[PDB]
Design a protein around this ligand. Sequence first.
Ligand code: HEM
Ligand code: HEM
Lengths: 153, 153
Amino acid sequence: GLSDGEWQQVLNVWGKVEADIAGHGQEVLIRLFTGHPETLEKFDKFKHLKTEAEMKASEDLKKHGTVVLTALGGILKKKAAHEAELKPLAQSHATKHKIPIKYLEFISDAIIHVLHSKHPGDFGADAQGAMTKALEEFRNDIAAKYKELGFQG
Amino acid sequence: GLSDGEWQQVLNVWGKVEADIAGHGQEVLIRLFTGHPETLEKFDKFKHLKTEAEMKASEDLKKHGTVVLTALGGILKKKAAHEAELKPLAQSHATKHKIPIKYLEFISDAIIHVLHSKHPGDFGADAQGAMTKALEEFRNDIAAKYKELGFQG
Ligand code: HEM
Ligand code: HEM
């Protein structure tokens, strides 16, 4: 994972991308298609683009560059926001509290039990299945940070 | 990964948790400590609590259950937000576009080159290292989704 420092360097340069997303997107795609021509073969809608000049002239290649970098920016920002809340919790539970993954499993089971007990009408089999998967994914995310910190959970 | 409806079910039940977070946090910790007394030994503040009654009267245990469910709710909400953008991208690139992970590495290389070319002042060696790490983690998150779909990227 990225530290707060590394995410800050990523988000700082992404601010420059957002000042001209279409220009950056066009340049990225032309760099990709000129360096690795097999990648252009994946775009049926760009079959008419046969030279770097034709690529530069394409309205729809520039529009697609905007689609790509807009989607990537969103995913980078949402990943950083998740990391900013997960990392401090994994740090303390690895290093200070020393909480095994087995104990995170026990509290996950307790949350499911209390939700079923307090919300039987609402928290039905499908919703309980959804929460079981969400808490498993949470434990796996902590376990990956544990392995990085050298803490055997 | 949760389906779109599955994340909405998790967010919906967390709204109910937040309507009585103190009560939910008490009942979760009481269920953990009564079901798995070995977990109570990690809490130097609570380890003297013997019965559900004593645990229920502890202001310190109630305070802590609220801190736990507040932290977990924030991580679930940030995970849901990241998944909502990552999942559809992985789905289309596996099932419709059939994009190998190597081609995502080629476009990552192009992004790093264009940012270095355009913004050298905000994209020195340390910032480039950070972006390399962020795009490798993005590719690994896509690869994880490919594996779930049985697409060999
Ligand atoms: C940073 C990496 C990438 C991002 C963020 C990205 C994002 C997107 C988005 C948002 C779409 C439109 C919605 C969708 O179908 O999912 C799309 C479409 C597509 N992408 Fe990607 N993409 C990436 C990399 C690639 C690469 C490397 C290739 C091929 C070498 C590729 C091939 C395609 C194709 C063929 C389409 C459909 C184009 C069309 O006909 O409309 N993608 N991509
Ligand atoms: C969903 C799971 C969990 C969440 C969200 C969570 C969250 C938190 C938070 C926010 C804190 C305070 C800030 C910090 O030190 O990081 C904390 C402290 C702590 N947690 Fe956890 N925790 C979880 C599971 C567990 C489990 C299973 C145990 C033990 C079996 C545990 C033991 C502790 C201890 C000992 C502290 C320090 C308490 C104190 O000295 O006041 N945690 N936890």
